[PDB]
Amino acid sequence: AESTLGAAAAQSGRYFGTAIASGKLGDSAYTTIASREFNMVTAENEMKIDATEPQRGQFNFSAGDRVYNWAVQNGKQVRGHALAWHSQQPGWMQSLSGSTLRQAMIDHINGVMGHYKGKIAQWDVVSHAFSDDGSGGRRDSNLQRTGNDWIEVAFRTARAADPAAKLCYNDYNIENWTWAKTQGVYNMVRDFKQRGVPIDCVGFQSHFNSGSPYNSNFRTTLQNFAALGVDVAITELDIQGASSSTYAAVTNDCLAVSRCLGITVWGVRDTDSWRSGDTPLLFNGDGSKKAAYTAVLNALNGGGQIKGVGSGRCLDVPNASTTDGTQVQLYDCHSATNQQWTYTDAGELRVYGDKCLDAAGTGNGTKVQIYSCWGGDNQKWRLNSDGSIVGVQSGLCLDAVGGGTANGTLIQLYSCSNGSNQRWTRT
Amino acid sequence: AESTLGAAAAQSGRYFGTAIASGKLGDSAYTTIASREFNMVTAENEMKIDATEPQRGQFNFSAGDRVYNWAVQNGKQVRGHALAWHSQQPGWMQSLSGSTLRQAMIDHINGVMGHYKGKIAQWDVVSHAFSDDGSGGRRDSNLQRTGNDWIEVAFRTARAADPAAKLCYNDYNIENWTWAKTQGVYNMVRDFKQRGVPIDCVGFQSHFNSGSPYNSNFRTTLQNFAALGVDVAITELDIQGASSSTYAAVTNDCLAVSRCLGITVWGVRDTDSWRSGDTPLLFNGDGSKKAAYTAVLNALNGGGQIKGVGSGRCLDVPNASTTDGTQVQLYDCHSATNQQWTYTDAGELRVYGDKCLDAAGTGNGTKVQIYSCWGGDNQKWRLNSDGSIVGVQSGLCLDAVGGGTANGTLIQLYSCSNGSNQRWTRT
Ligand SMILES: *[C@H]1OC[C@@H](O[C@@H]2OC[C@@H](O)[C@H](O)[C@H]2O)[C@H](O)[C@H]1O
Numbered sequence: 001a002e003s004t005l006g007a008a009a010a011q012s013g014r015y016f017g018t019a020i021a022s023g024k025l026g027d028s029a030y031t032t033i034a035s036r037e038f039n040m041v042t043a044e045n046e047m048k049i050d051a052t053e054p055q056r057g058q059f060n061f062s063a064g065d066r067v068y069n070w071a072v073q074n075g076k077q078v079r080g081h082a083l084a085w086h087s088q089q090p091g092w093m094q095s096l097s098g099s100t101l102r103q104a105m106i107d108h109i110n111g112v113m114g115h116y117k118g119k120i121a122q123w124d125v126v127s128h129a130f131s132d133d134g135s136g137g138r139r140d141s142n143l144q145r146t147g148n149d150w151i152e153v154a155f156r157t158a159r160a161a162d163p164a165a166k167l168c169y170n171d172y173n174i175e176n177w178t179w180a181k182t183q184g185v186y187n188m189v190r191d192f193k194q195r196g197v198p199i200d201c202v203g204f205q206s207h208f209n210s211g212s213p214y215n216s217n218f219r220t221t222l223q224n225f226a227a228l229g230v231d232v233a234i235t236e237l238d239i240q241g242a243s244s245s246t247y248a249a250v251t252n253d254c255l256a257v258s259r260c261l262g263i264t265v266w267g268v269r270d271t272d273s274w275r276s277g278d279t280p281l282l283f284n285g286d287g288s289k290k291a292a293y294t295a296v297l298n299a300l301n302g303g304g305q306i307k308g309v310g311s312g313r314c315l316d317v318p319n320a321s322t323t324d325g326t327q328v329q330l331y332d333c334h335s336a337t338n339q340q341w342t343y344t345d346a347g348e349l350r351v352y353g354d355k356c357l358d359a360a361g362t363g364n365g366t367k368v369q370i371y372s373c374w375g376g377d378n379q380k381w382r383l384n385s386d387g388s389i390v391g392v393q394s395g396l397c398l399d400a401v402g403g404g405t406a407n408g409t410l411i412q413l414y415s416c417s418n419g420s421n422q423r424w425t426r427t
Numbered sequence: 428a429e430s431t432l433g434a435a436a437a438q439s440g441r442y443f444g445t446a447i448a449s450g451k452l453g454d455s456a457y458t459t460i461a462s463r464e465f466n467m468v469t470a471e472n473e474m475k476i477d478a479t480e481p482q483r484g485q486f487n488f489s490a491g492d493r494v495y496n497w498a499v500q501n502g503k504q505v506r507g508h509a510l511a512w513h514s515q516q517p518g519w520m521q522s523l524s525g526s527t528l529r530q531a532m533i534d535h536i537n538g539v540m541g542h543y544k545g546k547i548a549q550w551d552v553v554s555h556a557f558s559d560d561g562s563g564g565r566r567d568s569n570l571q572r573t574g575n576d577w578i579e580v581a582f583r584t585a586r587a588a589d590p591a592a593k594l595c596y597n598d599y600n601i602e603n604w605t606w607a608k609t610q611g612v613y614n615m616v617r618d619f620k621q622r623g624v625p626i627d628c629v630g631f632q633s634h635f636n637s638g639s640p641y642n643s644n645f646r647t648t649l650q651n652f653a654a655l656g657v658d659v660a661i662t663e664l665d666i667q668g669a670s671s672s673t674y675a676a677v678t679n680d681c682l683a684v685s686r687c688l689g690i691t692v693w694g695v696r697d698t699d700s701w702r703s704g705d706t707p708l709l710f711n712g713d714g715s716k717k718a719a720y721t722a723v724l725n726a727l728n729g730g731g732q733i734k735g736v737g738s739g740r741c742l743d744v745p746n747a748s749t750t751d752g753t754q755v756q757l758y759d760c761h762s763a764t765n766q767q768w769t770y771t772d773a774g775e776l777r778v779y780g781d782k783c784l785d786a787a788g789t790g791n792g793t794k795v796q797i798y799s800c801w802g803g804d805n806q807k808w809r810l811n812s813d814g815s816i817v818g819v820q821s822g823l824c825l826d827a828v829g830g831g832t833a834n835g836t837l838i839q840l841y842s843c844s845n846g847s848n849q850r851w852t853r854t
């Protein structure tokens with residue numbers, strides 16, 4: 001299969017997952033998308049320390065089990081997150097220190113993994129243990145204060161608790177190979193593999209934004225870790241603005257690494273994101289597939305003028321007008337700026353540099369025209385492999401009215417039918 | 428004098444107003460912006476029929492006076508809206524028809540205008556009375572069903588109630604001259620003037636979006652009505668996406684017509700808008716001035732490479748790199764693509780076509796770099812006449828670190844100081 005992300009990833013033995021929030025499982029729109037598109041699930045918060053052990057020695061898996069059960073019942077594997085780290089610790093653990101904390105860490109690992117023994121594909125045993133100060137050293141936390149060997153102990157503890165799960169070390173800002181933090185983690189994992197410390201995978205948060213941009217060397221980082229004899233996984237992927245090229249680039253980086261088990265995006269819809277202001281996911285708040293969704297799907301499946309297949313004519317702006325509201329048409333192809341369209345990272349089809357292919361509404365018969373670019377979803381489009389061009393907001397296809405093929409035939413939105421008047425070739 | 432919208436508009440004897448919502452007056456950010464920028468106020472809902480006459484014969488001005496008092500206390504004039512129309516009628520009026528409704532309409536006009544007698548600059552006596560069906564005729568409402576002369580009667584009643592107020596007929600979709608609706612309204616106003624019916628102005632909602640685009644013939648529309656002997660006013664202006672060129676065009680249309688009294692935008696911040704999803708106003712949710720704000724201010728005030736004054740060097744992307752996160756610098760100006768910036772309608776400074784001048788943060792010293800364009804406010808800039816370039820999200824100026832002038836000098840964000848290292852020209 002290749003119409004959904006998970007199924008597309010499965011073609012190469014990989015998975016495409018998401019972070020599930022138990023509180024959203026009652027949202028039909030949410031579950032419809034999540035059950036259909038992903039085959040791997042990570043509990044967004046339900047399996048963390050405070051959620052699973054609210055009081056010292058008192059475990060609770062009500063929320064964790066609901067996420068786990070929803071996942072397995074809907075055909076998805078699960079990544080456990082997270083067993084031992086400085087963040088979101090319950091009040092009682094935050095106050096602990098020394099051997100007492102070290103013992104509480106061990107007890108927590110045994111309790112949680114024991115509850116889910118043999119049912120978890122991957123466990124983020126330790127996460128966010130390194131600093132961002134630029135030294136490439138450990139983060140100063142109550143756990144780190146118990147001794148530099150706490151991470152190694154956590155992993156040894158984890159292996160014994162559940163030998164069937166892949167044990168991962170997860171962190172962020174370790175994607176760019178030139179960063180000190182990336183090197184610090186690399187050296188630790190290398191040391192671990194050399195000394196025989198039980199670690200099977202390294203998780204890369206992959207939280208990209210202009211403050212910590214994606215860089216092509218992320219593939220090199222993944223390959224360098226894979227060379228150490230550990231699998232790698234993109235664990236919390238989200239990209240500020242959801243650039244189509246960047247999402248495709250990250251997807252292809254995993255596909256280029258044999259040991260990359262799969263990719264998980266941190267959330268379903270932008271409105272479900274912990275960073276919603278950055279609209280960093282693959283689905284909009286209304287549940288519509290974004291331009292980035294198609295870019296990712298295309299990559300997973302192994303994937304100028306815009307000419308209509310049925311007419312042989314090009315998408316044209318009448319008389320090279322730059323007036324907002326000018327409906328586009330079909331016209332004999334020729335070298336002119338009013339027939340030169342540029343597909344942007346945001347999913348727009350631009351002309352003249354700052355004018356956007358624009359849908360004047362959302363239903364069948366909607367006029368498609370040029371309008372000043374401003375970021376509306378009615379100005380975003382998905383370029384499908386079959387040649388159809390679908391409006392993000394409407395979910396409708398660019399359509400040459402009535403199947404017309406002569407010069408002057410107007411363009412509208414219309415239910416996709418795979419008709420020749422809805423298929424386009426880019427040159 | 429020329430630093431705020433109202434003051435700039437006053438330089439041509441006009442006003443620049445907004446719609447005020449009484450329920451938002453407790454918001455310090457809201458009132459700070461509103462009090463500072465506008466010299467005309469329209470109550471968004473507080474002076475409508477249901478808000479001023481909750482029961483037949485029982486008037487209530489608690490809501491209206493809160494808006495009125497705030498306006499006068501802050502030096503603004505007031506546009507009354509709206510006395511007789513089909514929308515937002517209280518239940519008791521919705522139940523009326525024929526002569527009973529006709530008298531209730533007259534009583535309402537007398538009651539409300541009497542309360543505000545002599546304190547209102549303009550009153551939208553009747554609003555939204557024409558149909559959008561293309562016939563150019565009247566909208567079917569209980570008022571229209573009382574007789575075609577209801578509008579005339581409303582105006583005659585209003586003149587007698589308060590001879591000091593300018594009486595306006597307000598409507599939408601009457602901006603494009605070619606529309607039947609526009610001409611139907613024109614015919615009515617012409618008839619009124621010819622027969623001596625008291626009408627002093629025509630208000631144009633000016634609600635523009637790709638579904639009902641702004642058209643340059645709007646200036647001829649304004650001119651046509653002005654020639655009838657009535658003033659004109661842009662009453663509820665908002666533009667989808669807040670296109671800078673469109674906002675400037677509309678502003679210039681009013682500035683070109685001597686009888687255009689002024690412009691009112693329908694709201695303060697995008698988040699306050701009745702159509703917030705179209706981010707159609709001049710201020711963002713966090714209260715920052717958008718690129719469109721500067722476009723309007725510039726227009727009211729009379730109306731490639733980016734060289735730094737003093738250094739004489741141009742904004743340059745190091746080694747013509749296209750890598751996200753590359754900090755920009757100053758460098759000898761030369762015909763190169765890694766220079767050549769394009770200011771878009773959305774307020775971006777683009778390079779390479781799809782890369783955006785990007786601020787990785789909001790404080791002083793913030794790195795200014797290139798990043799994929801996605802619409803973030805940290806990618807929007809305002810080009811001031813003094814030569815400064817201010818980041819919309821940060822409110823800080825593009826700054827050449829340490830006042831450096833040699834090649835390699837990095838660009839950052841920094842509190843505006845009018846220094847030569849924060850002044851740019853184009854070129
Ligand atoms: C990676 O970063 C995202 C983390 O998830 C968030 O943690 C804080 C919660 O408030 C938020 O809802 C979560 O999405 C995740 O645990 C890290 O590993």
Ligand SMILES: *[C@H]1OC[C@@H](O[C@@H]2OC[C@@H](O)[C@H](O)[C@H]2O)[C@H](O)[C@H]1O
Nearest residue numbers: 471472508509554597632663693701
């Ligand atoms: C012009 O259009 C906007 C109208 O104002 C809105 O009316 C409906 C309310 O729910 C909304 O809050 C208002 O902004 C105005 O009255 C018309 O003249």
